[PDB]
Symmetry: D2
Subunit: 114 residues, 4 copies
Amino acid sequence: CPLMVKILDAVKGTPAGSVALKVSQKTADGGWTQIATGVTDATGEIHNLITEQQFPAGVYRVEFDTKAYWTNQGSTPFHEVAEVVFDAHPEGHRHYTLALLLSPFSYTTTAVVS
Amino acid sequence: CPLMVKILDAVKGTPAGSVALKVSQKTADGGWTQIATGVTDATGEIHNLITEQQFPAGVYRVEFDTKAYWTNQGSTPFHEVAEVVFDAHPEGHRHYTLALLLSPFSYTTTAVVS
Amino acid sequence: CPLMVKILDAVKGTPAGSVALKVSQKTADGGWTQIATGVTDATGEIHNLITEQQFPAGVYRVEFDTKAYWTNQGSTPFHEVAEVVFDAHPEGHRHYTLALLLSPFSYTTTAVVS
Amino acid sequence: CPLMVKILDAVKGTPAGSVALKVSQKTADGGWTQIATGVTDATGEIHNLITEQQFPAGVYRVEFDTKAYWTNQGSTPFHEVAEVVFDAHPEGHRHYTLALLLSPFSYTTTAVVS
Ligand SMILES: CC(C)(c1cc(Br)c(O)c(Br)c1)c1cc(Br)c(O)c(Br)c1
Ligand SMILES: CC(C)(c1cc(Br)c(O)c(Br)c1)c1cc(Br)c(O)c(Br)c1
């Protein structure tokens, strides 16, 4: 699997479970095609999000529903959504882990690229 | 001005100058209307980016072109853009500062709301 | 003033007011001399924390009492303090801004150096 | 093992290998006893840093030699050292992972607490 996520809650110091997300691929004319959805498990991860066959080079977007996560935690959030938009270069079995650190008014998006 | 940005370069320890961005307002059918653009000055800011009248309550997207910033610095970045999406409640001259901390494979988006 | 701080609360989206800190200068035998203290104002800052004359070249530690800040907010933090340790080169009126972003289980320490 | 680390390089998007660190425990009179050293492997981790027997409750400090890491990467760093100072509450087999995101002029210290 070429695309994984790891989400941590910076208020509690635990993985962020039950965070919903959507994965989209940019079209040539600049639009977006949704290709996958998922929800983090209690470890802040999702397994088998997409396959290598679904992951050519190009621009991708992962939308994390952080506003719902914070509302359910009981904290008013700033962001309406957490969008991570990146260029993928899969040639060579390069894998990507999108790491995300969440606070109600702040998040950090990092990548670990194999 | 109710919407400010402050961008920092975490590699150099300086404000991120000459970063292009665009501000868009969400439409009823889920689209986006571009309402302002600019390029940060040497302090990582854009003075007077939008007016009170241009900033009614609603969802906004500020798209920062971080890729070109890094290319110009000589690095190969992960993200295509930095996205900050939020619901604005400008009543009472409430003000929004979008702080952004940039590294080639990571950024942090923080909000300072009056 | 050559040494400034700017502290933000990532839970609330506001500057972190009423954070105690201490500034220490490293000694030859590896010890630490306290040279200044203060408490941030409502903008997350301490105006005029030290003078030019108090800030010769050398290694400094700024210790922020983030634990008590969080206890007072009602959260149970991870860190005992936030530590920022750096070698200062104040020649030419070079200025240092210590930016600090706080959550109960995470902080980011960034430097803006002129 | 009750204390682990995970270090990422935010410039390259890879784990930070070969980062040296020292672990110390605070004494009653406010001093420090070094109890362990280590160096991250190519995954940014260290295994078997300390034992549970070595890890009573108390104040601990992990000093990461990030200045040497950045010098060897070829980038001038801001911080002289990255110090993570925390209260440990091991009762119940609670484990701690110190996560660290490194840029030359910025780092983020987070904890994952089981
Ligand atoms: C404290 C705050 C929000 C900040 C707000 C304003 Br306005 C400033 O001018 C500066 Br200087 C700092 C900040 C921003 C970023 Br970006 C950081 O990486 C970290 Br750490 C802290
Ligand atoms: C989610 C978390 C805590 C993480 C924990 C483990 Br354990 C991992 O192996 C990986 Br990868 C990520 C993390 C860490 C850093 Br350093 C970050 O900059 C961000 Br954003 C998130």
